[PDB]
Amino acid sequence: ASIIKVNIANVLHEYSTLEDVKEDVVEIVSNLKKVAIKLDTGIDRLDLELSVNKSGVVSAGDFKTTQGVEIINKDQPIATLTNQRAFSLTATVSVGRNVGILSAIPTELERVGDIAVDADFNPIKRVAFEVFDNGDSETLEVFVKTNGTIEPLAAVTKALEY
Amino acid sequence: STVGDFIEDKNNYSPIEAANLENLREAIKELIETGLTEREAKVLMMRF
Amino acid sequence: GKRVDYSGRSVITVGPSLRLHECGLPKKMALELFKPFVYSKLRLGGHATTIKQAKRMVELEEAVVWDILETVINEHPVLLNRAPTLHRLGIQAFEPRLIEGKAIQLHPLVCAAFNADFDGDQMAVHVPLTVESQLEARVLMMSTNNILSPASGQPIITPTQDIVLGLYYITREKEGARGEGKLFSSYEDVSRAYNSGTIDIHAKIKLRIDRQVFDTKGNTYNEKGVVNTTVGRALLLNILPEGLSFSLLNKVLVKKEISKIINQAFRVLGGKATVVLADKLMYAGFKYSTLSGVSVGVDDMTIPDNKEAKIEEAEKEIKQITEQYQSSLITENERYNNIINIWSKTSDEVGASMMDAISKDTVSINGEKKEIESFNSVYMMAKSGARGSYNQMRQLAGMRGLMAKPDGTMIETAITANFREGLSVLQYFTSTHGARKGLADTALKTANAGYLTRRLVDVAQDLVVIEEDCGTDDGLMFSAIVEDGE
Amino acid sequence: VTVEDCLDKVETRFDLVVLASMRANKILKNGYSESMENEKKEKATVVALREIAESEITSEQILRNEIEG
Amino acid sequence: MSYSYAEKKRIRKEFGVLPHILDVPYLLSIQTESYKKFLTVDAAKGRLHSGLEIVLKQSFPVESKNGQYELHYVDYQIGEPTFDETECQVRGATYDAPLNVKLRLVVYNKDALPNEKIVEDIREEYVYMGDIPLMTTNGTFIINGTERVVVSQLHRSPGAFFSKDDSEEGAFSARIIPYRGSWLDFEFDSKGIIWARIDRKRKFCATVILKALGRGRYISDTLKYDLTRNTDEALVEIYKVLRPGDPPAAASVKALFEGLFFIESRYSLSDIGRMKLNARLGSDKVSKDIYTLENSDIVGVIEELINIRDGKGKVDDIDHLGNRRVRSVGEMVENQFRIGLYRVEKGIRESMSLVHKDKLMPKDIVNSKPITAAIKEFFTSGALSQFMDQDNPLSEVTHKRRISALGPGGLSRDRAGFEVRDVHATHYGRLCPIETPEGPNIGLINSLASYARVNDYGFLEAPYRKVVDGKVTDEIEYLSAIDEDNYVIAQASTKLDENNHFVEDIIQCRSGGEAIFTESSRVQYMDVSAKQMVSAAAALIPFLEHDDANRVLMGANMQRQAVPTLKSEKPLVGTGMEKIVARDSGNCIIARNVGEVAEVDSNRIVIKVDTEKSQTSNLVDIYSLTKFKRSNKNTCINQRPIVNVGDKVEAGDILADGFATDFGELSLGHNLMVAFMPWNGYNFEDSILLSERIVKDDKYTSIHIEEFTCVARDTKLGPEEITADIPNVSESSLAKLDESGIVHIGANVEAGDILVAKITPKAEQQLTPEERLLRAIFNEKASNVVDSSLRMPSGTSGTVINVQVFENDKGGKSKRALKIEKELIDKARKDFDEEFAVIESVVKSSIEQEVVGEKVQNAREYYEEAKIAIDAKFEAKKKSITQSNELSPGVLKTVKVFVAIKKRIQPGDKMAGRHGNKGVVSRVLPVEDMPYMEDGTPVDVCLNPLGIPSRMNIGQILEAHLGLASYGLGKKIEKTLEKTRKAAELRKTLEEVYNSVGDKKVNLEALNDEEILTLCDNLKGGVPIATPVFDGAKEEDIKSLLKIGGFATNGQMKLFDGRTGKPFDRHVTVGYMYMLKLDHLVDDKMHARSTGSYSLVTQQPLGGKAQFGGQRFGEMEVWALQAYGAAYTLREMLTVKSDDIAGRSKMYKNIVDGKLTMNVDVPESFNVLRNEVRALGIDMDFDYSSE
Amino acid sequence: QETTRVLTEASINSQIDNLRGLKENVLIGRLIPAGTGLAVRKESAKIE
DNA sequence: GCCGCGTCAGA
C-alpha cells in the first residue's frame, strides 16, 4: 500500500514554488513516493492528514499517528523549511500491486489541488535462492531483502500459497 | 518549405463533408414514403 | 509525386516473435487508416445509424470499436516501404496484427532486403482499397513470395548476424566432453539428455537416423544407419524437414553453409517448405545463442608477444636507410619507397602473428598438452562471418601502420599503436584525415548512383516480354572468361 | 497466401490473379454479405483463392460466368 | 583536496601524470570580445577609437553644394535600454539601445569666396541616429522576444594570391582581393601572353592598364599584340569592355576608370590587404595607411607574376589557415551601419535642396529611417543568425563557438566539393577535426578548438611553450599559423628528466607541419595541453584515444542532442571537462563577493558580504532563480539552490545549479548496470532492452512545455469575440472554461479540450431545401456565426502552468479586463514592495548588528536607490501602450497558454551512448525476467556484443569496466557506513578507497568530521572517477581498482537467467555504461492520416504532418510497382488516392456503403498541365485516331 | 529532361503520339501495357 | 578544310 494522491494546502499544480521552502513541489512529490507505509489487512484505503508549524525540517514521522497507519521511514524528510511557516497536506493511501506501466489506471482527481502520484506497491527489493544436498535430501536457502513493511516468513508463505 | 505549398483549398467541400450530406438527403425521401400515402408527400415536395 | 492519403510513417522495432508474413502495427495508426472501413462495419452492425453518430462514437474510443477493427484487419494486407527504394524488394506486403505502442514491428529476416537497421530508421505503410489491388498485392507483393534476389538466385532471407553465431557455436565439437561416445536412438532421447545436462552439447555421440531422401532425378530413397554427430547437430535434426539429407546439418554450419542449405531446400522442397525451415532456424538460433551467453571483453583481444621485437627490427632498418641517405649514397625517393615497403612488411608480419595466438589455444589434456581451436568470442564472431572481418581484428590486436593522406600517398611515419593500447595525439591526428575523406566521399556518391539508375530506367523503361518465342536461330558464343591467371 | 497451391492449376501468376478478382467481384455482387457469415469466415477475395486451390470452380468455368452477368 | 564548496560536497577521483601548465581560456570570450571592441574603446588595448565612432567620422563631412552648411561629428551618446533582457523576452520586445550623435553646422554670408560660412550656425544639438541591439554577458541577442546567436564566418583574407591551373603548363594567375568592391585578376597564356580582366569580361592584355597609367621579353610580345595607340584609346577600350553597345564620352570614361579602383569609399583594403601586399612585395615605400590601389602596387604585382613564370617564388595555398580569416558578428553589424550611414549621407545632400526656414537647426536634415531598417533586416533575416539550440547547456556552448564559411561571401553547399571539406595541417591547432555535420554541410562547421584564440587581425592563434638550450621554459606564447610552419613543435606527451630536458634522443614532432621523427635538439616548442587539439565537446567523451574517429564524431554530435531529466545524475566516469563547461555557460549562479548566506528559499538567494576581506560593497546582494523557464526546444529550465543558511561561501563558487547541472557538473545521462549478451533477438541489430526499473524509478522522464497562442482580428463582416458564449456547446465542455472564457490555471486539459472560445460570423448560408425542411420540422434557427476555439491537438495531455492576455490599444479597459490588469500590476508591485521591504528589512537588521559600527550617512541613500528601481518596475508595467505591446494594427486582442506535460521513455525511443553507440528500445521486460548476478541484483540494460567487434569503439568496454569498478567501490563504502558510523574509521576507509591507487593524494584530512559524513552518504551510490581524454588511466590501474572492490580481475561475471534460474555457460562483462536519451520521441512521429485537406493549386494532400500530413509516393516506388507488374495498385493510387476529386468522393461513399465500384476518368494534374501548355502557343488536346 | 526544346520541336512537327508505354499510361492514370494489364486484355479478348 | 574561342544543359 503506497500514497497515490497528495493535496498541498496552497498549490494549484505540481510546478509551483511555496514561500520560504527550499524543496520544490515536484521534489516534495519525489520525497513522498520513497515513503514506506504499512497498512492493516481490512483498511484497504485510508486518508492521512499532516499539519506542521515547525521552523525546521518536515519529516514522515511528522504525519499524524492515526490508527492502522504505520510509517517505516521516520528518517526520510518530506520537506525542509528555511523560515517558520504553517505547512499542511493530505495524502490518500490504498492497497495496490504493480500490473505494469501499460495496464495502469491514471486515477480520478475531484479537487482542483489534487495531484496524481505514482506508487510502487511491491516491497521486495531483492530475492536470492541456493540449494544444499544433505545426502538423500536437500535444504533450500533463500535470501529475501524487503523494506520491512511485511515479515519475511509471512511473505514466503503467501508466495507459496499463490 | 515554401508559403505557396501551405495554402489549402477552403471553398470546396471535403469528402467527409460531401458524404454526410448524401446520407441526410437519402434518409428524408424514405421518411416521406413511410408517412402519408401520397397527398401529404406530394404537398411537402411541392411547397419545400 | 502524387502524394497519397491512407499512408503512415512510424519507427521500426525488431519484432522477433512476429512471423515472416506478419508485422506489428500500432492500434491508433490502424484505427486512423481503417476508420472509413470501421464506419461501414458499424453501420452494417447497426450500432450507429448515421455517419456523424459513428464519428462521435469513434472519437470516444469505445471498447466495441477495437473488436470491429480487429475483425476488419484480420485478413487485410498492408504495404511497407522505405525512403530509398533502390530495388522492388524494398516495397513488400505484410498482414498487420494490432499491437500496443507507437513503434512498427517487422520480421528480422526481411530487414536485410529493406537494408535498414533499428537505429531510428522510419518506414511508411500504404493500404490497398481496391479488391483487385489487395488480392494482387497478396499474390505478388507478399514477403513469402519473394525469397531469391531478382538480380541473383542466392536467397535474401538467410540469417545475417546473431542467429548464425548461435548455430555456429552449437555445431562446434569438443575432443573431450561428458557423455562422449554415448548412443542415442532418437532426437527426443538426446533432447532429454540435454535437459538433464549431464552430457555436454559439444560432446560427440552416435545417433541412428532413418529418413527418406530426394535424388536430383527426383527419385526418393530411404537413408538409414548409425552416424556420429555432435549433440547440437542432433538437436537441430528435429527442425530439418523430411526429404532433406542429414549431411547438410552434419557440418560446422557456417553462414555460407546456412545459405546453401536454404537454396537446396527451396530448389527441391519448394518455397513454402523453405520459409518454414527459415522460421524454425531463426527460432532455434535466438534460443541457443542466449544459452551460450557469448560476451566481448578487453582481455579477449590478445597482443602478440613478439610485436616489440619486430617493431625494434623495423626501426633499426629505417635508421640504416636514414644513415645511407645522410651520406648521400641513396636518392631520397628510393629511401622513401624502401621505408614504406619495410613498414608494410613489418605490419603484415605483426597481423599474421596475432591471428595464430587468438585462433589457437594450447591445453594440457590427459596424456599431454595439444593445440585446439580457440573458443574466444572475437575469433568465433570473425570465423562465423556473422559480423566483423580480419582487418578489424588486425587493427584492434595489431597496428594501424601506414595511414593514407588526402592525396593518398602513404605517410613515411607509421603508427605502431593499437586501439586497445590507445594512440598518441599526433598519431590520432594523422589517422583523422583518412576517416574524414571517406565520410566526405560516402555522402557525395549517393546522388551519382541514383542519377545513373534513373538514366538506365529511362533507356530500358518501355522494354517488356510480349511473345513466348521470337523463332530466331541467331544468338551469341559463350566461353569461360579466363583472366589468364584463373 | 503462398499462391504456390493456386499456381498448380493456373499459369503465369497473372491469369490466376485476374480470375480470382473476377470471382471475388461476382461473389460480392451475389449478395453473399448478409453480415451473419462475414464475421465467422474470411473475406471473399481469399475465398476465391481457396476455391481455385480446391480446383472445384475451374478456371474455364469462371470465363463462362462473365457472359451470364 | 577539493578546495571548493562544490568540490567539498562530493570529491571526484582524478588520474594522469601530466601537470596543468595553463587553465582553459573562457569559452564565450570570442563572441563577447568582438562586440566590446565595436561598442567600447580600451586605452591599454590600444583601441582608442571605437569602430562605430570611426565609421561616423569617415562620412560625416559633406559640404553638400556651396550652401554655407558644414557637417561635423562632435560626440556619440548611447541611451540606456528601456527594458532588461528578462523583461524584453517576456514582452517579446527586442533588447535595444538608442544611438545619439552631435552635429555642428557653420553658416555665414555665403558670398562668392568671401565669408561663406564663418558667422552663423554657432548652435549645435544631439540628433537621434537609430536603435542599436545590445548583447548580454552570455553573448546572445534577443529579437522579437526570441534569443538568437550569430555564427562566426570564415572568409578568404584580402591580399594578392598566385595559383596555377595544371590544365596547361605555365598558366600562372595573379589575383588582388579588396576588402570591398571589384578585384582585378591577371592570367598567363600558353604563348606566354598576359591577359587582364576585372571580375569577368572580354580578355585583354595587362599592358592596357600600364598604358592608361603612362631578362624581360614578355612585355615585348604583349606590347605588339595590343593595337592601342594612346592612353585615351586604352581608356575608351576599357569603357567599351565594361559596357557593350554604349557610346564613349570624353570625361565619362576618365571618371569611371579612376572611380572603380581609385575611390576610397568604393575601394578599401581594410588595412589587411595592404599589409599583406607590402609584405608580399616587401616594399615599405608605399604608404601602409592608404588602402587605395596604386600604379606602383600594380606594376609590382605584374613583376611578381613574371618572376613566378621565370620560376622564382612559391604558389600560395587557398586552404591554408593564414590565408583564411574569421569575421565576428560585430564587423558585419559595422558594415550594415556603414551602408545605412551612406544612404543617410545621400539623403542629407538631397535634403539641403529644399529650404523653408530662418536660422534652421541641424536636426531636421538628419534622417534615422535608413540605418534602423538595415540593421533590423540583417538581424531578423540574417542567414548566419539563427535560433540558439536550447536542448542542453553544452549545445548552447557548441553553437556559439561554431564558425560557418557559408553565408554572404561564402562557398555554396554544392559549389565546393573535395577541397575545403578536408582538414589542413594548420587545422590541428585552430579547428578540432573530429566534430563536423554528418550531412552535406559536413567539413564546413569547422567547430573552433577549446584553446583556439582570435588575433586582432582575425587570424586564429595557438598557445605554445618555448624551449631554451634544450630546456623547456615555462613561458607561454601564442603562435600565428604562418609563424608555426617554420618552427618544429614536440607533443606535450614527451617525458622529462625533471630538468625539462627530453630523455628520448628521437621523438615524433611536426617540423613542416607533417608528423615526422626528429632529434630532440631541433624541437623549438611544446604543446600547452594534450586536449588542446580536441574541441571542448570532444573532451567530454572518456577513453577518446581507444575509440575510432568516425564513431567518436557520431557520439559527439549525438551527445549535444541529449534531453535533460527531472533529477540530474553526475556521471561515474568523467573527463572532468564537465565542471568547466557548466561554469562557463550562464546556467548557474556564482557569488560576486565572499559572504555568508543570510536567507535561502527556492525563489531567490540573499547573501551578506563581509567588507573586511572584500572591496567596498553594499553589504547585501540578491540573486533571483528561474523556475520552469520555457526553451526553444520546449525543454523546462529551473534553478535549485545547493546553499544552506549560515554557510560560508567564496566568489566563483556555485550557489545553485540551473539547467542540466548537478553539483556544478553537467550531467546528460543516468548510470545503469549494463550486460553484454544477446538475449531473445530483442536486440538483433542496434535494439536496446530495458529492465523497466528505470521507467518505474523515473530514471529517464523529461518535462516539455508547450505554448499555444490565440489571437483576435477584426474581419470585414464583424469583430470576432473570444467570450465563451457559443451555441451548440454543452455546459460540461465549458465547465472547465472560466466565466472570462480562459481555462483555469493548473487545470488538467484532455486532448481536444477547449482552451479558448471564439465565434466568427458567416453570411449567405444558402441552405439547401432538405436542410430548410429539417429546420422547419425542428423549428431550428440557422446560426449567422461559427465557433473557432483553440483546442490542444489529439494525443497531447498537459496542465496550464501560465496564462497571458493582451488587451486592445486606445480603448478603455472593461471592468473585468481593466480590473484584472490593475490587480495584476498591484500584485507585482505589492509583492515587489513587500519583497523590496524584505531586502530593506534585512539591510536594517544588518545595520542593527553594525549599529555600534557610522551608518548615519553610510547607507542614507541606499534605501532611496532601491525605491527608485521599484518605482521604475511599477512604471514599466504601466509604461506599456496598455496592450503590453504595439499588438500589430487590426489585432483586437491576443492570449498565450502554457502547458507542461511529463514524458517517460517508451519503446521506439532512441538512446545514444557517449562513445557513439546508438540504439532504439524495442520492448520493456519484467524485473524477474532480466538476468541477475549471484547477489541477485538485476541488470538494467543488455547490449549486443557483435556490434562492438564490427566498429572499433573499444572505449565503451573500458568505460564499462571502470564503471563496474566504481560500483564495487561504492558497495564497500555502504558496508562501512551501514554500521559504526564514526568519523575516525570512515576517514581510514576513505584513505584506502582514494589513496589505494593513483598519485592524486586527495588529502581528505582537511574535510571536517561533519563534512566526511555527508561525503560518505553522497558516495553511497558510486565513487566518481575523472580520466583525462589523452591522459586516461591504464588497464593495470583499473584491474587494481577491481581487486580493491573484490571483483575478479575481469569485466565478465557469472550470471543466472531469471526465467529458469540456470547460470549461462561463460561469464558476461557488466559495466555502468553511462547512457543519454536523444531528443527523438516517437510520440510526434506517428503521423497517422486517413483524409486530409488538399493543395489549392494542385488539389493534392499537404505533407510533413504540419496540418494532416500524409506520405508522398516516390517516383522510384513507381518503378518498383512497374517491376512487380501490379498495374491495378499503381493506377488506383495515382488517380483516386491523390488528385481524383470525383474518384475520392465516390471511393469514400463506396467504402462507407461497402459496395464495389471504381471510377478513374482522368488525373486533375494532367488537366492543369494541359491548361499551362494551352496558355502557350503550342496546343495539346485529346483525339481519336481511325488510322 | 530538356522539356522546352522537345516541346518546341514537337509543336512545329504537329507530332501525333500514341502512348505506347508504361510511363504514358501513368501520366493519364491508365493501366500500363505490362504485367496484370496485358493479362486483363487477353482475358477480355477470350471473353469476347 | 580547321584550330581555337563560345552557349546550352544537367549534376
Ligand SMILES: Nc1nc2c(ncn2[C@@H]2O[C@H](COP(=O)(O)OP(=O)(O)O)[C@@H](OP(=O)(O)OP(=O)(O)O)[C@H]2O)c(=O)[nH]1
Ligand atoms: N511461424 C510461421 N508460420 C508459417 C510460416 N509459413 C506458413 N506458416 C503458417 O502456415 C499457414 C499457411 O497459410 P496458407 O497461406 O493458408 O497456406 P500456404 O502458406 O500454403 O499458402 C499459415 O496459417 P495462418 O492462417 O497464417 O495462421 P495459423 O494457422 O498459422 O495460426 C501460417 O501461419 C512460417 O514461415 N513461419
Ligand SMILES: [Mg+2]
Ligand atoms: Mg541507417
